[model samples]
Target: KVFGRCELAAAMKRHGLDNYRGYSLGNWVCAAKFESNFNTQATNRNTDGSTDYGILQINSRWWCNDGRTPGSRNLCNIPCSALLSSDITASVNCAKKIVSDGNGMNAWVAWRNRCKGTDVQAWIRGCRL
Candidate 1:
């Protein structure tokens, strides 16, 4: 599913992404924008034989099991396919784990390069959050 910017922001806000791990709703919205363009089925194959899945781009190496990534930790204890679903609940829950695991939002390079230290609120401007 391709979510509109405000639609995605509303969803993230409902899921408590606002101020989660000290990152505001705008931060999460910015990250998701650059990471997957709000496409739920987005996926990226890494050079390390692992893959990043779904909107938040949870990685196969440590977050989910795909039966392909060598030495996968499966820390999220879920099939990588679940991340592709449009529901986003699993993806959001796993993202919370990623942040709480000390990686913070830095787990996503897009967030680091595009959202960090920027006016992230612009990502959610015009949204009635």
Candidate 2:
């Protein structure tokens, strides 16, 4: 499912992303916007031959076991397919792990390139968090 900005904001809020590490809800909303356009099934193959999956684009190289990433760690201990579902609980949980592991949202290049050090409040302007 493709999530609207408000929908994604609400879902992320419900799952505990609001200031989860001093990163605001808008930060997450903006990351998802640029990462995968809020598309749950989105996937991007890395130049290193790994793949990123789902709305937050969790990578196959370390987070999930795609069973084909050559040296995947599966640190999230989830199948790559799990991240593609419309029900994003697993995706959210794994994303939290990524942040909590000292990476913060910097794990996502889109977040760095687009949302970092910017005025992110607009990303959730109309969203009732």
Candidate 3:
């Protein structure tokens, strides 16, 4: 498991995701917690025949390319497997791209389902970020 502090710090510096574009860093941190527990290797294979990738869980449904899945827009232009690893720069950038398009963090269902209207400061409060 990766440390939350590390994720938040590098996310800000490397991906420029701290308050990036228009979204707050809190939202990204919150999504990372619920989506993958900060696990870069995290992936979820759903019965409907789709997948979620990386700390952000960008889906094969629209974001990343995984040849196994059909009709993916591949908006991120990166391989789906690239997200399921330690380097999350691509995922964070893609997520920001998504936010810029519309829906903000709501596109990441976990953020809406688990973090929206919820006191999510705990996501970074004690992480020393």
Q: Candidate 3's error at 12, in angstroms?
A: 4.0
Which sections of candidate 3 miss by over 4 Å? 127-129
The C-alpha lDDT values of all candidates are 0.91, 0.92, 0.76
State the local distance difference test value for candidate 1: 0.91
Q: Give stretches of model 2 more than 4 Å off.
A: none
Task: Summing lDDT over every window of 10 consecutive residues in candidate 2, give the lowest-scoring window.
Answer: 101-110
**Ranking of candidates on TM-score, top first:** 1, 2, 3
| Model 2, residue 123: C-alpha shift (Å) | 0.8
Candidate 3 yields a Cα-based lDDT of 0.76
Question: Total clashing residue pairs per candidate?
Answer: 0, 0, 0
Per-residue lDDT of 1-129 in model 3, one digit per residue for the tens?
364655555555457887776656677788888888888888998666789988777788888888877666798898998887677778877887888877777888888999888876566665544
Which pairs in model 2 have colliding backbones? none
TM-score of each prediction? 0.97, 0.96, 0.86
